[PDB]
């Protein structure tokens, strides 16, 4: 039984030449070796294991456009998003509609420059569209180490080092090194925009950073976590996906910096009488899911995938469709890896999951406690 706070529901939105495939698939590469299905669940325990093991659900949004209820309804499925930008093209108008959704819904998110190695690249510029197209406020986490032909690896502005991921195993291990002596001044003087970001937390980091003082590293970490899941902030990494030399350092990312189920606010609905109503993120609540996505299996038949947002739902259990007023029993749920399906026999709020076999859902469906009715979506 993984706790709550270990849950990370994430999105990778990424469009046109941005790699969302390749980001994609090195996520759950790395992720495999540690230790297109609607939602992917795999774990990760940090780029040098530092971590405790985060519960990491992936959530296929769409690469599209052109359906934007999609769009709107992935978005309150997830609960942060990983935004993909090419270094060359930079912000584009496919990624700038879905981030005006993004904010519409206050969804946390952190961002990847991928591409590194293509000739253009050009990190800088990408973070300036972040800030001035975008209207949000980037707080830079990494520098690249060269660009183009001459993309090297990436620099950790918090911990002042330069990250070398190992050519020979794909990326699996890397080392800490100094930072090269040509690119220091840049990284202090980029470092000390994070300090100023996240003097922001508080009155005591406030002092500290008016008068000088030096902060630690979890107190960066604390006030970068949350200023980025209150939508003050959005931390920008850098790389390449295809060159094994980034996504490493993103999955960190979205452990430190993305939000829990429990770090976002409690989804809103109404009853069947249209009073507005609230399910919060407890297994005492009761429950509630969204249904997102109607597949068809070739072995079990349909799989209704759907985020619980409060109670337990167990095989077996009576609910109801508060959109068609229709009850539905329950059968077999499973989980999807990346190359695995996994049968369980409850899920939690905060989790994704596929029902087996149901006669009454689509897409947008509410799935409820038959005596405590809430209808999530219209
Ligand atoms: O330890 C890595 C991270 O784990 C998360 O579950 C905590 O909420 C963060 O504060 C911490 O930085
Ligand atoms: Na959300």
Same mark, same amino acid.
């Given at each position: ?280 993120? &407890?297994?005492? $609540?009761?429950?509630?899911?969204? +249904?997102?996505? @109607? *597949? ?5 038949? =349909?799989? !209704? ?34 190359? &695995?399906?996994? $049968?369980?026999?409850?899920?939690? +709020?905060?989790? @994704? *999951? ?5 006669? =009454?859902? !689509? ?16």
């Amino acid at each position: 039984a993984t706790p709550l706070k270990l849950y990370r529901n994430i999105g990778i939105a990424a469009h046109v030449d941005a790699g969302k495939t390749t980001t994609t698939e090195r996520v759950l590469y790395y992720t495999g070796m540690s230790h297109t299905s609607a939602a992917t669940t795999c774990y990760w325990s940090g780029m040098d294991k530092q971590f405790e093991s985060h519960r990491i659900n992936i959530i296929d949004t769409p690469g599209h456009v052109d359906f934007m209820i999609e769009v709107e309804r992935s978005l309150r499925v997830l609960d942060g998003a990983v935004v993909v930008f090419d270094s060359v093209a930079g912000v584009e108008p496919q990624s700038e509609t879905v981030w005006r959704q993004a904010n519409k819904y206050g969804v946390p998110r952190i961002v990847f420059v991928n591409k590194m190695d293509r000739m253009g690249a050009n990190f800088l510029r990408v973070v300036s569209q972040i800030k001035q197209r975008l209207g949000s406020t980037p707080v830079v986490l990494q520098l690249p180490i060269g660009a183009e032909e001459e993309f090297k690896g990436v620099i950790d502005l918090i911990k002042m080092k330069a990250i070398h991921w190992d050519e020979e195993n794909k990326g699996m291990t890397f080392k800490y090194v100094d930072i090269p002596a040509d690119l220091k001044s840049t990284c202090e003087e980029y470092r000390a925009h994070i300090i100023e970001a996240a003097a922001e937390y508080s009155e005591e980091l406030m002092e500290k950073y008016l008068e000088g003082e030096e902060f630690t590293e979890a107190e960066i970490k604390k006030a970068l976590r949350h200023l980025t899941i209150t939508n003050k902030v959005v931390p920008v990494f850098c790389g390449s996906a295809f060159k094994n030399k980034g996504v490493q350092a993103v999955l960190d990312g979205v452990i430190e910096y993305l939000p829990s189920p429990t770090d976002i606010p409690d989804i809103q609905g109404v009853d069947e009488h249209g009073d507005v109503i609230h399910r919060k993120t &407890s297994y005492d $609540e009761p429950f509630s899911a969204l +249904a997102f996505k @109607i *597949a068809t299996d070739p072995f079990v038949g =349909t799989l !209704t995938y759907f985020r619980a947002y409060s109670g337990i739902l167990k095989s077996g259990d009576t609910v109801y469709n508060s959109v068609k007023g229709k009850k539905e029993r329950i059968g077999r749920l499973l989980q999807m890896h990346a190359n &695995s399906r996994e $049968e369980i026999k409850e899920v939690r +709020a905060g989790d @994704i *999951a596929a029902a087996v076999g149901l006669k =009454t859902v !689509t897409t947008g469906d509410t799935l409820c406690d038959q005596d405590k009715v809430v209808i999530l979506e219209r």
